[model samples]
Target: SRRRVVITGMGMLSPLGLDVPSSWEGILAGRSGIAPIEHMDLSAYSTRFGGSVKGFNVEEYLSAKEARKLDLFIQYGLAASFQAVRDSGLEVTDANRERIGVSMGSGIGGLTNIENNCRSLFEQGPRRISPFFVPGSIINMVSGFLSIHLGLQGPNYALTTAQTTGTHSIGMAARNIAYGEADVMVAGGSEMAACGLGLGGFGAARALSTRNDEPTRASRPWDRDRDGFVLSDGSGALVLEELEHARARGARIYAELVGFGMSGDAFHMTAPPEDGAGAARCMKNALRDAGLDPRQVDYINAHGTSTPAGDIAEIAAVKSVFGEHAHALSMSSTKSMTGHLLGAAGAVEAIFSVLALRDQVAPPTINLDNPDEGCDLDLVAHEAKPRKIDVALSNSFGFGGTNGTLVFRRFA
Candidate 1:
């Protein structure tokens, strides 16, 4: 018999809010988290705004000594993981500690650390660089540090699949548990790439919005005047446990992770196919994996990054996958409020999808004043809408043409 996987706890630190409840509240209220970038001076860049996490203090989750040894990205991951573990109330006894695992990821891990170290090498020579640079900035350090901190010993792993990192991490973690490698897993992704090169590289690629005059009004997915995605910094984590494990422990179940799917566009490095064939197929595969029909899905937390081509392609993909039922279901982009968290986007959006199922409310797509021609579906525009959401899907597409879809069903 196959094991079942479910989400027991979730934590997030996003541009919108410090944790999941606050973030979800902000989402339902149609609040925008995008604002002027404050981490560094962006006077030279065309786009000077992003969804930077505000009011975050590392000391809340880590001691001074521990915080000093890690990069900001790792700190964010640790904080989110701490919240998730506490929320799950999973007592890691010596007996079960070996059966718990971690699978987290980051798309552009430690970019801030890399940039600072490179500057130090140029200005003050290699002697001035911190000794913790290697351990602090590596992509897999999030998982390593998390495992050591939480004493989770089974199947420690991390992935770096551009924007699909979080979705892939959670999906893979669920698979590990379903296959009996572990009884519980902590899974998600984190990102803090809003620094100099982080912003400059994407800006040079024209992937970021230059709506410097109106930051809040940016990230208008499906809007006619949509410019580009707004970069953001944050982390999202979830506690996944086998159904029997959760029930035996009397843990509260948020939603059952019924399906996960992955695909590669194989056409472009940064752009998806114009027809969205790969994205459509990815969603189809997830539905098939869940043994669900297209009409059974009620809500979609769209990966609508507000980029021109990306938004339209996703819309076309949804229309193709859901056929006539696409018009009946509600779809919205919380990225319009939270900006784009890159690697963490999938995990954060997945949580929102679960909340939508739990609350029977579809979050809104803010700043969508004027919808484009093909984007005629009910986007739950501007404000939250109450609905019966039995099943929800969250989509994530990355820069390397990677795609991921996760399906969550309301727990009985």
Candidate 2:
């Protein structure tokens, strides 16, 4: 028998808001989180805007000593995980600690920390570098630190598959439960790459928006005026449990994680195929894995990064996969409000999709004043819409031509 997995708790530290409820409210209200980059100085870069989390206090979740040893990315993860664990109402006693696990992802982990440490080493000396630098900056530390904080003694792992890493992590976590390796998994992604090196690298690639003059409207996904993705920072997590396990514990089920699919373009390093064949395959495969027909899907959280090629390609892929029913489903890219979160994009968007199902309100792709012709889809534009979202599919693709899709449905 195939094992069933369901999401019991959700947590978020996104540019939109500090937690899931706040973030959802912001999205539904059509508020943009994009702003002038205050997290770092971007005087030399063409793009000076980003989706930055404002008023986030690490002390809300961690002590001074603990915060000092963690990179900002990992801190975001820890904070969100704290909310997830608490929300799940899991009693993690010593007996069942070994049956819980963590699978988190980060596209560019601790770039800010690495840049700072390397600069210190070059300018001052090796002695000037802090001893906590390595532990703080490593990608896997997000999972490692969560394990210690939550007293979870089960399998702890991290994935780094660029933008698709979050969905990949969730898929892996579901697999773990399916195989009976663990009864519960904390799965998600975090990113805090808004610093100097982080911004400069993506800016140089011309992957960031230069709409510094109008920061609020910078990230306009599937819009004609869209320039590029606005770099953002934050984390999102979900607590996934086996169906029987959650039922036995009287856990509040949010949504059922029904399907997952991943594929590679094998064509480009940074760009996806112009035809979007890779993404189409991923969505089709996910539907097949879920034993669902295209018509059954009610919504999609598109990987619309606000980039010209990416937006067009993803739309084309969806059309190919869904055929005529593609027009029936409501699709939106919350990136227009939260910006591109890199590796954390998938996980965060997955949360958004599931929440949409739970709440029956689809978040809109804000700032789509002039829709792009090539990317013509029912992108819930400008404002949130009320819908009966029974099942939703979230799509995410990375720079390395990797594609991932996850299907989630409201748990009855």
Candidate 3:
């Protein structure tokens, strides 16, 4: 007998809000979280604004001593994980401690710290570099710290695949439970890249929006005026548990994680192929894994980062995968509100997808005033819309041409 995977709890910290409920509410209301860069000197950068977590007090989740050495990304990850574990009511007793695990990831982990440490080494001295820097900034530290703090001992790991990190982490965690390596997994991703080096590097790559004056309107996915994505910071997590395990504990089930698929575009290093074949195959594989037909999918939470090339490519991918049914299904990008969260985008969007199933409504792709050519799909625009959403799919495509898709359905 094969084990089943279901979502029992969710937690998130985004520019829009601090937790899942607040963020979801902001999305439905078409609120934008992007704003002018604060507390940072950005006179040299072209894109001076992006999404950033506001009013999050580290003391609420970690002590001064505990949070001293860790990077902001790790702090955000731990905070969200604490929320998820508590939300699930998952007590990590000695009996099940060895059967629960954590899988969290980050794409560009500790960028700010890495830059700071380098400056410290050269300007001051090598001996002045902090000893905890290595352990604090690594991509796997989120999972490591969670395991040590929460007493979870089962199969602990993280997948660091740029923007696809969260989707890959959560999907692989589900596989671990399905294969019986664990009964429960806390999975998600977190990111913080608003510092000087981080923003400067992405800005040089032309990957960030230059709409510094109208920051909130910057993340306009599929819009004819869309320039580029707005870089952001945050974390999102979900407590995934085996169906029977959740039932025994009387855990509140949110949705069933039915299918997961991943793909790599062997053709490009940074850009997906113009044809969108890689993403199309990724969605097809997920649908096949779920034993679902193309027409069965009701909603899609797009990996629409509001980038010029990515938006049209994803639209083409959807057209190819769903064919005529693409016109019937609704698709939207929460990135329009929260900006592009890099490694954390997939996990946050996955939560939104499941919530759409729970609420029977699709969140809007805000700021899409004029659609670009080849973007004729039924994109929920400017405002949320009530719809019949039984199965929801979330897509994440990264800079390295990696892609992941996850399918979730309403649980009865």
Candidate 4:
């Protein structure tokens, strides 16, 4: 017999806003969170537009001293994790502390820190580098910091599989509970790469859009006018608990994360396979893992990052996996509004997926005025739509051709 897991709580810090309700409200209002990059000086870069978090105060979530020890990525993770722990309302006494764990993921740990330290080493010498530099940039600090802060001593781990990081972390965490290794897990992903090096690297690869003239309208996924993805920053976290464990504690159940699947293109490092074969298999495997038929999934938060090739390939994969039901599925790429968060994209979109299942509202893909002929799907474009979502799927495909899919079902 397999163990049943339930999502008890969710927390998020996205380009839209901090917390679930604020972000959901923004999504429902069909507002784009993209704007000019203000976190740092991007005037020197070719692409000056990105979806940066406006007014994210680290002091609000952590002490000044503590915030100094972490990079922006981990800070975002801790912010979301703090919300998840509060929302879970789980009392971690000495007896239950060993049964709780954290499994967080990040794609690009801390590009900003790397760039800063590298410059310091070269120009100011190694002695001038801060002692906290390595810990600040390390990916594992997401889980490590959360464990220390929450006193969770069980199975703390992190995943770094590019964009597939979040879904894979959640899936692996679920496996731990299913195998009776733990009763509760903190699972999700975080990413904060809106720096010179971050933008320059992807920009050089021609992966990001350079539409400085219209920042909000730049990420037009599935649209004929699509150019490229707009880089974004943020984090999202979910609290997963064993079904019986949650019931005993009377936790507020959000949704059931029923299935997860992953695949590798093995074709290209940055571009998806032209046929989208690997992406199709990922979606197919996730549906199978959930014991769900294709028709059962009513909504999909697509990985459509607005990049010309990525958007088209993901749509092709969706059509291939769902077939005739593809038309029936209400699909949207929230990244059209929030931009792409890479590893954290899956986790943030997972929160949106679960929320769509619970609220029965599909967020719109903003700025989709011109639909592409070949990529024809009922993308909930321009405005939010009211619909009963029984099951929702979120897809995330990364630069290394890694793909991940997750299915969330509404719980009675």
- List residue ranges in candidate 1 displaced over 4 A: none
Give me the displacement of residue 176 in model 3, in angstroms. Answer: 0.3
**TM-score of each candidate structure, all chains considered together:** 0.99, 0.98, 0.99, 0.98
lDDT tens digits, residues 70-173, model 4? 88899999898888888989888899999999998999998888888899999999998889998888999989999988899889999999878888888888
> Model 2, 1-412: lDDT tens per residue?
6789999998999988999999999999999988887766678888888888789899999999889888889999888888888999998998899999999889999988888899999999999998999988899988899998888999998999998988898888998998899999999999988888888898889888898899989989888988888898899899999999999989999999999998998888998887799999999899999999889999999999988989999988988998888888999999988999898898889899988998898899999999988666789999999988998999999978999999999888
Between candidates 2 and 4, name the one with more favorable lDDT: 2
Residue-level lDDT tens digits of model 3 in 1-412? 5689999999899999989999999999999999998868898899889889999988988888989889999999998898889889988899999999999999898988888899999999999899998998998899999999889989899888999999999999999999999999999999998888888898888888898889999999999999888999999999999999999989999999999999997877778887789999999999999999989999999999888889999999999999999999999999999999899999899999989999999999999999999899999989899999999999999988999999999999
Residue range with the least summed lDDT across 10 consecutive positions in model 4: 37-46
Residue-pair clashes per prediction, in order, are 0, 0, 0, 0
Local distance difference test, candidate 4? 0.89
Q: What is the C-alpha RMSD of each candidate to the true structure, in Å?
A: 0.8, 1.0, 0.8, 1.1
- Residue pairs whose backbone atoms clash in candidate 3: none
- For each candidate, the alpha-carbon lDDT, in order, equals 0.92, 0.90, 0.93, 0.89
- lDDT, residue 297, candidate 3: 95
Candidate 4, after superposition: displacement of residue 66 in Å?
1.0
RMSD from true fold, candidate 3? 0.8
Q: State how far residue 129 of model 2 sits from its true place (Å).
A: 1.1
